[PDB]
Amino acid sequence: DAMRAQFMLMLDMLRETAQESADSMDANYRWFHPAPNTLAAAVGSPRMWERKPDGKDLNFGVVRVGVGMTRPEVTWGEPQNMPTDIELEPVTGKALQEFGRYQSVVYNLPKMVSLLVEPWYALVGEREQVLGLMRAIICQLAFSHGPDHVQMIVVSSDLDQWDWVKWLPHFGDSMVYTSVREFAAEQAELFAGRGSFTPRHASSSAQTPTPHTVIIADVDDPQWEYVISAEGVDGVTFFDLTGSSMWTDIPERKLQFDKTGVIEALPRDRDTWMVIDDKAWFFALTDQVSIAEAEEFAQKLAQWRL
């Protein structure tokens, strides 16, 4: 019993060491990716449009979509000289077993998505959920990335839902379209000229051109096959709000919404964003903003210029 009592105490000190490192990660991640409802009050602070493409900023092209599980910055070493399964003491065994299962993950951290890693992201769910998430994504980008670095385009038939977009500067020009034929004449003539998608990384960010393009698809037009079968273009990223079959045929680019607002997708590595498994699973709990909140934030942002 004296050995058992000593072993339990040794584990508690490891727990205290683990807990402190996790708190440092919480402090840091919140500082770069706040909750969408808090963004308006920060508009006057120097935190707005802080993101830089010049290689040293590891957060460029990253957008917050919700909260979920993530791996801590700790590295656990395997136990040496392990006793055989037929010889283990039953108390310390379960203690060390449970320790490994729960202390290997930290709950309620902000989950993120990277623009520089995929040609598109198919959003599949009911209209109300999908529009909620998309508006949040636009204002998340708008606060963190400057208009000189990000430009945004919407292709939609339900123009009544995008009326609030009018105030934002990222939608300006020297910009919402009704159909692919219309978009093809004005915008595609410029963008279709060259390239295809190419996954980048932080250090590579210094080489890509400054204006990144975000395209939102809300028309379900079959005419899109030209750019999709060509595997897009570099410097562009598409978000499908309809869930059309041409975009929805790739699991590595599909996000599925549950009735409870939980989103499921394939797991990706925290350090390289590379896909690590072939089966879809829990990914993040959805955050969403109203039309009023979007216009309110957009009006506050419209007051400022370079």
Partner 1 sequence: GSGYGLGLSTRTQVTGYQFLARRTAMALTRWRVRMEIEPGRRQTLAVVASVSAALVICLGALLW
Partner 2 sequence: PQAVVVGVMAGEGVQIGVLLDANAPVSVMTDPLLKVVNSRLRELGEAPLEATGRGRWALCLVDGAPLRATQSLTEQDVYDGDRLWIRFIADTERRSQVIEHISTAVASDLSKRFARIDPIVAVQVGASMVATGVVLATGVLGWWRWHHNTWLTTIYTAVIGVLVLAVAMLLLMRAKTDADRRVADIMLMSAIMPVTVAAAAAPPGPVGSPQAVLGFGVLTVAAALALRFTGRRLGIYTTIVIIGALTMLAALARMVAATSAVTLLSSLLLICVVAYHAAPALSRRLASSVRDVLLQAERARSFLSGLLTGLGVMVVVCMTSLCDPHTGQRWLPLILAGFTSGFLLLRGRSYVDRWQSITLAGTAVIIAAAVCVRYALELSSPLAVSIVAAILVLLPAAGMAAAAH
Partner 3 sequence: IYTTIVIIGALTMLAALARMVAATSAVTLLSSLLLICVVAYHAAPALSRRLAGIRLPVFPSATSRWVFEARPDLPTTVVVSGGSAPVLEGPSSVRDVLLQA
| Residues of this chain that bind partner 2 (CB under 8 A) | 8, 11-12, 15, 19, 22-23, 26, 30, 34-35, 37-38, 40-42, 44-45, 95, 98-99, 101-103, 106-109, 292, 296, 300
31 or 281: whose CB is closer to partner 3? 281
Identity of residue 255: L
* DSSP run (H or E) holding 99: helix 90-102
Report the SS3 class of residue 136: helix
User: What b-and-e string marks burial along 32-64, b requiring 16 or more CB atoms within 10 Å of the CB?
Assistant: bbbebeebbeeeeeeebbebebeeeeeebbbbb
**Of the candidates 148, 156, 167, which has an alpha carbon nearest to the alpha carbon of residue 239?**
156
19 or 223: whose CB is closer to partner 2? 19
Sign, Cα dihedral of 115, 155, 123, 172: positive
- Binding flag, residue 16, partner 3 (CB under 8 A): no
Extract the tokens encoding 130. Answer: 């999908």
What angle separates helix 2-32 from helix 90-102, to the nearest 10 degrees?
0
Q: How far apart are CA 239 and CA 237, in angstroms?
A: 7
Q: How far apart are CA 95 and CA 112, in angstroms?
A: 33
Residue 279, φ and ψ in degrees, nearest 5: -110, 135
- From partner 3, partner 1, partner 2, none, which one binds at residue 166 (CB under 5 to 8 Å depending on kind)? none
* Minimum distance, C-beta of residue 107 to partner 2, in the bound complex (Å): 4
- From partner 3, partner 2, partner 1, none, which one binds at residue 282 (CB under 5 to 8 Å depending on kind)? partner 3
- From partner 1, partner 2, partner 3, none, which one binds at residue 4 (CB under 5 to 8 Å depending on kind)? partner 1
- From partner 3, partner 1, partner 2, none, which one binds at residue 89 (CB under 5 to 8 Å depending on kind)? partner 1
Extract the tokens encoding 233. Answer: 């273009």
215 or 294: whose CB is closer to partner 2? 294
88 or 95: whose CB is closer to partner 2? 95
- Binding flag, residue 25, partner 3 (CB under 8 A): no
Contact with partner 1 (CB under 8 A): which of 11, 58, 82, 91?
Answer: 91
- Site residues (vs partner 1, CB under 8 A): 1, 4-5, 8-9, 89-91
